[PDB]
Amino acid sequence: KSSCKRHPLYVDFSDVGWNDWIVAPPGYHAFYCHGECPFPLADHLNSTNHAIVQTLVNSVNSKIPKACCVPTELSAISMLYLDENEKVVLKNYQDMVVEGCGCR
Amino acid sequence: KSSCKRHPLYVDFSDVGWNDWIVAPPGYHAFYCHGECPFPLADHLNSTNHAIVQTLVNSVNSKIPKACCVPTELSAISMLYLDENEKVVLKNYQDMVVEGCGCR
Amino acid sequence: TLPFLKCYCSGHCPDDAINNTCITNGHCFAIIEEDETTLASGCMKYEGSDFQCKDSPKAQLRRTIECCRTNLCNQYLQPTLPP
Amino acid sequence: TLPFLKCYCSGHCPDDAINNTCITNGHCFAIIEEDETTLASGCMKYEGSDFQCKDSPKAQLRRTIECCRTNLCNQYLQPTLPPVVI
Fold first, then answer.
1. Which residue of C has its CA nearest to A62?
2. Which of B15, B48, C18, D15 has the highest local Cβ count within 10 Å?
3. Where does it reside (chain D)?
4. Which CATH superfamily is D1-86 part of?
């Protein structure tokens, strides 16, 4: 429907069934990117030159796909899980949270 | 059909109609990324943790989209164009060539 | 390369826009398309703007885009479809 | 974090694979899916592997994935699908 943008997505470790090995947190806000990359690509869609050129090419011939709405900025989060040893470990997972979206 | 991968795409500045302001080169290989991001995401699809998690969530509920095949590495190129002043200028455009693809 | 231009946006406004305006370091643009005909405007980042403001004479759908670099030069712009 | 593991790949081979093998710094995997049933294998990067090797018990389609960290441990692995729900 609309343009590329960030959408809310909460991952509850129980719904997916990971609460058996992940002790904390019980869930977290991951978010996700989605939406069209039209012409022209506006400032806030923070896109690369290639995405620009690809979008124009698609305008000349639709056999070539449009740019894609994907994460452009991501933050990490910390989790407490149980390794095979049955011991609680603290790990810091990178790129777990979508901070911003864009057309690539 | 197949998985995420780089595809060939040559941009001829005459076909798009830019040969009036771009003196050199006459065209260039831009390439483009395309293809599915299935589960699991293999090593060569070089994806982020978020992409991984998003792909699993999509397996539990298809309302959430799959990761997208987009450029992950890009190189620049130099071009010689005419600015409004009718003067030939040399500019180096970043992220013009898709060097590699991945699932984001 | 810090945003300094204030533009009027319509159809291409970022989610945090205020009173239909966006800020940018590139250009303000207005565009008409067809297939019916609509008018939109917004902010265009500087990098890659020469590609977008030129557009391609060989696009499948007829449309005209115009760019300017003056605060709210967007506001009143009526590009005209190509003959 | 330099690739050191050699795996057998099938269906998930990178374009530059040699004799159906890939190299990685993570795990080798084999997986069976349905909807009909198929078997695939490949290399899995280390980062994010704990998520993928665990998989989710609540995926819509039945499938089983297995991971290992020994050269060509892929080769001969026959995961067994989850019993149909009744």
1. C60
2. B48
3. Cell membrane; Cell surface
4. CD59 (2.10.60.10)
Cα distance between residue B52 and residue B47, in whole Å? 7
Cα(C5)–Cα(D36) distance, integer angstroms = 57
Indicate which CATH number applies to the domain containing B91: 2.10.90.10
Give the separation between CA B87 and CA B83, rounded to whole angstroms. Answer: 6
Q: How far, in Å, are B47, D22, D36, D61 from residue D33 at the CA level? A: 22, 21, 8, 7
* Technique used: X-ray
Cβ atoms within 10 A of the Cβ of C42, count?
29
Residue with tokens 């994907």: A70
Neighbours of chain C (3+ CB pairs under 8 A): A, B
Resolution of this entry in Å?
2.9
Q: How many domains does chain A have?
A: 1
A interface with C, Cβ–Cβ < 8 A, is 3, 5, 39-44, 46-49, 52-53, 56, 59-62
Query: How buried is residue B2: exposed, middle or buried, by Cβ count under 10 Å (0-12/13-18/19+)?
Result: exposed
Nearest one of B35, B31, B32, B33 to B1, comparing CA atoms:
B35
Q: What CATH architecture does domain C1-83 belong to?
A: Ribbon (2.10)
- Find the radius of gyration of the CA atoms of chain C: 13
Q: What is the token pair recorded at B95? A: 């992220």
CB atoms within 10 A of CB A74: 19
